[PDB]
């Protein structure tokens, strides 16, 4: 949904730039450049806020999927060390269990 919102929000932005270049004389004639700049800020802000949420979603995933990985490291290291003291893993597979 964010990526769909990421793309569909930047298509009106590039078209808005193209149409301003197409009819620059008309816009200055009506003295409507005050409104069109305000449209740009509305067009740009929608594009940025769609991207900011996309970045946050990636950051939300990456932090959560790395505390899970960190929890694996502690669990794997704890059992591997204990199994290297009683089952005598001989510290060989322990390294592979960590790297």
């Amino acid at each position: 949904d964010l990526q769909q919102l990421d793309d569909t929000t930047q298509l009106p932005l590039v078209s808005h730039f193209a149409e301003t270049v197409e009819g620059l004389t008309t816009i200055r004639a009506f003295r409507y450049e005050a409104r069109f700049q305000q449209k740009l800020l509305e067009y740009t802000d929608s594009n940025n806020i769609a991207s900011l949420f996309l970045t946050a979603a990636n950051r939300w995933l990456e932090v959560c999927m790395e505390y899970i990985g960190a929890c694996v490291v502690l669990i794997a290291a704890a059992t591997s060390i204990s199994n290297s003291l009683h089952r005598e893993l001989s510290a060989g597979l322990v390294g592979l269990g960590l790297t």
């Binding site: 929608s46 900011l52 949420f53 946050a56 950051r59 939300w60």
Partner: protein
């Protein structure tokens, strides 16, 4: 927590982080880290003796629980702009600092020395407790809520007061600025309600 189960004002409520919100969390995380080191040392030392020697780590184990609640308790006082409850927090930092310092100086009387880790961690805890104490006092200096007749109250920022602002990353507790916890509600909402410009 029992009221939060049936609390609707927190549906869109605003907040106001107290002066020193960042210096509180960075100290707390440092404090939590060192308390784990004391736990590690305490459980390390008692393994040679025939007895448990619970006084090595359980005092530190209780501190780690107390430190965690001290920031949960502080946060609940940060979301609800009621600084008066910080007196209980202020007493804790004053009391913990005094008792820990007495322990630290008594190590020096017996000539523990920096060569022992417990002397280093105890000395470190005095600084962390002292700095956290100054943070609580600095809250009173800027909020002026305990003694001063005219409190200098602070209002939530204008951009936060908007109901039309939902990217609350710039204004959240420092732990949610790192773990992006505030996104959890938005992510769950995406499953039921599709994400549009609304």
């Amino acid at each position: 927590w029992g009221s939060q189960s049936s609390k609707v004002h927190i549906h869109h409520s605003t907040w106001l982080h107290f002066p020193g919100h960042n210096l509180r969390w960075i100290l707390t995380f440092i404090l939590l880290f060192v308390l784990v080191c004391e736990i590690a040392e305490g459980i390390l030392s008692d393994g040679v003796t025939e007895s448990r020697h619970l006084h090595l780590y359980m005092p530190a184990g209780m501190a780690f629980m107390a430190a965690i609640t001290s920031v949960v308790y502080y946060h609940n006082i940060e979301t609800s702009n009621f600084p008066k409850l910080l007196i209980a927090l202020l007493i804790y930092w004053t009391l913990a600092f005094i008792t820990k310092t007495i322990k630290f100086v008594k190590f020096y009387d017996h000539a523990i020395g920096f060569s022992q880790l417990r002397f280093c961690l105890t000395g470190l805890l005095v600084i962390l407790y002292g700095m956290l104490l100054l943070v609580e006092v600095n809250v009173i200096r800027v909020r002026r809520y305990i003694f001063f007749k005219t409190p200098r109250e602070v209002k939530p920022p204008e951009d936060l007061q908007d109901l039309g602002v939902r990217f609350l990353q710039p204004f959240v507790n420092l732990l949610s600025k790192g773990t992006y916890w505030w996104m959890n509600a938005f992510i769950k909402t995406a499953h039921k309600k599709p994400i549009d410009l609304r």
